[PDB]
Amino acid sequence: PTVFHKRYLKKIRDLGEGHFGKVSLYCYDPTNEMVAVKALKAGPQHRSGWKQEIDILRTLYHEHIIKYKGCCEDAGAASLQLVMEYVPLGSLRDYLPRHSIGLAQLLLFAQQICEGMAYLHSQHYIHRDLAARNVLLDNDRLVKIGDFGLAKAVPEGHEYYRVDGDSPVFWYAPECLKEYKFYYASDVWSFGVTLYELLTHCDSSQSPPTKFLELIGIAQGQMTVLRLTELLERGERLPRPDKCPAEVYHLMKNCWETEASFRPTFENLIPILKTVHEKYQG
Ligand SMILES: Cn1cc(-c2cn3nccc3c(-c3cnn([C@]4(CC#N)C[C@@H](C#N)C4)c3)n2)cn1
């Protein structure tokens, strides 16, 4: 809709990179507004998918989903550039290690991620990359899902998408890892991992790749994924974060049920987290 003229785009700084793209901060100044611009870094499989990605964000209208500004005829790398709002405090992965946030605020953030996710699922889309690095902080009381690079439509007569080296396998349910099927419930498993990350304040030594690789080992050839799948199937899970309530840990564990149908939906999670937030808010 809003065609941002490439001439008025002044690069301020790099914001971050993810799978097949890079996001950068720009001032859109036709004389002398801060916007976030995503550009393709990349194979021809992901280049045809890029247009599909832009159309996904273009049709999402939600308070806990990053605001799509427009596009620009990007000659700079031939494929189109995606213009979004600049979400001023950044990703939770970058923010939480330096800012000690209370349990109450963390649970609000979790509730808001569920609202954005329940909305995404009602639009017949799966995210496939739900992690703290993809959750942006607008202010201390507002969070938004900020990136949709792996987001796909679930085909109409199926309950899953049939799904690479860039897969976030440490955020993935066993069905994605073993059967390469991504269900709406596979996104709930990743949410449980995002909630663990939030509760550990995104501390590196406590991260899911760190924790799972201490359980797998690093000398496993091409078998890290297989070893991950079998430990998950044996019932092993990420530990309870220090100072994470026992009830919140069980909620997380319910998000990590091996059987996808035993997991809560995002719609089921919203009233539960609302109540848990209200309890720790006082
Ligand atoms: C003070 N401060 C603000 C920021 C800030 C603001 N905004 N606004 C829109 C986007 C961003 C990002 C940002 C970083 N990484 N990403 C990605 C993952 C996601 N969401 C998107 C990219 C790909 N591909 C990685 C976005 N970072 C950082 N520090």
Side-chain angles (χ1 to χ4, degrees):
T2 352
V3 174
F4 284 75
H5 306 286
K6 200 75 191 73
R7 189 188 179 164
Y8 310 146
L9 290 169
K10 197 171 186 176
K11 186 159 161 173
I12 301 161
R13 53 183 177 270
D14 280 334
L15 296 172
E17 47 201 297
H19 301 120
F20 273 76
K22 156 98 96 66
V23 166
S24 283
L25 170 72
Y26 286 79
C27 188
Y28 186 56
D29 213 346
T31 58
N32 252 283
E33 196 55 64
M34 274 200 283
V35 292
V37 166
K38 180 172 186 173
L40 230 48
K41 260 182 283 208
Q45 163 65 232
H46 299 263
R47 283 190 198 281
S48 46
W50 174 234
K51 276 83 198 182
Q52 168 231 277
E53 174 175 353
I54 292 169
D55 300 327
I56 283 176
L57 190 66
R58 198 149 102 193
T59 61
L60 305 161
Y61 311 92
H62 194 273
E63 63 163 306
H64 303 297
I65 291 182
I66 195 174
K67 290 184 206 293
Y68 165 83
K69 236 108 175 69
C71 282
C72 65
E73 264 196 295
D74 170 64
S79 50
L80 277 114
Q81 257 168 31
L82 180 51
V83 186
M84 307 153 218
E85 62 172 324
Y86 174 63
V87 181
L89 305 188
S91 78
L92 286 183
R93 174 177 62 90
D94 293 323
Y95 191 88
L96 299 178
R98 292 126 120 271
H99 306 85
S100 34
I101 300 310
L103 176 59
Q105 254 193 105
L106 288 172
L107 302 155
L108 179 69
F109 291 169
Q111 187 216 127
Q112 294 177 338
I113 289 148
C114 290
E115 284 171 271
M117 284 304 286
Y119 170 78
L120 184 70
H121 283 180
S122 60
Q123 291 280 88
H124 294 18
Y125 297 124
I126 46 162
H127 193 276
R128 305 169 68 218
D129 194 26
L130 185 61
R133 64 171 165 274
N134 292 331
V135 181
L136 294 168
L137 226 215
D138 209 280
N139 63 80
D140 50 46
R141 261 72 182 188
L142 216 193
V143 114
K144 286 154 186 194
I145 304 162
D147 191 81
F148 299 85
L150 300 177
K152 297 282 182 169
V154 178
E156 234 80 88
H158 306 266
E159 56 181 69
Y160 58 84
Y161 176 76
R162 277 206 236 259
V163 308
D164 264 44
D166 61 335
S167 291
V169 302
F170 296 113
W171 279 257
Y172 275 14
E175 69 270 6
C176 316
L177 300 181
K178 208 184 201 75
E179 295 165 63
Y180 304 91
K181 289 166 174 174
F182 203 93
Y183 295 82
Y184 291 109
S186 301
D187 264 336
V188 170
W189 175 289
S190 312
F191 164 69
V193 180
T194 301
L195 173 62
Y196 167 85
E197 280 190 279
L198 265 46
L199 271 288
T200 67
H201 284 83
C202 297
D203 172 22
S204 252
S205 51
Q206 280 187 280
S207 78
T210 298
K211 303 316 274 202
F212 279 122
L213 285 161
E214 283 156 13
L215 290 166
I216 296 155
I218 61 171
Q220 280 302 313
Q222 298 175 280
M223 313 208 144
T224 298
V225 175
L226 242 175
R227 280 267 185 243
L228 174 67
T229 307
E230 62 191 43
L231 78 89
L232 280 185
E233 287 180 339
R234 286 193 314 266
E236 288 173 77
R237 290 301 183 272
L238 291 162
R240 172 189 179 167
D242 235 62
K243 309 177 271 79
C244 162
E247 66 178 312
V248 186
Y249 191 50
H250 301 138
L251 187 159
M252 241 160 71
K253 300 258 256 165
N254 186 219
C255 295
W256 305 323
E257 289 292 330
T258 307
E259 182 47 51
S261 55
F262 303 174
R263 298 180 200 140
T265 68
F266 284 114
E267 302 238 65
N268 296 153
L269 284 164
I270 298 150
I272 292 171
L273 283 163
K274 277 215 176 88
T275 301
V276 183
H277 168 57
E278 287 180 44
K279 180 209 194 149
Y280 293 99
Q281 212 173 0

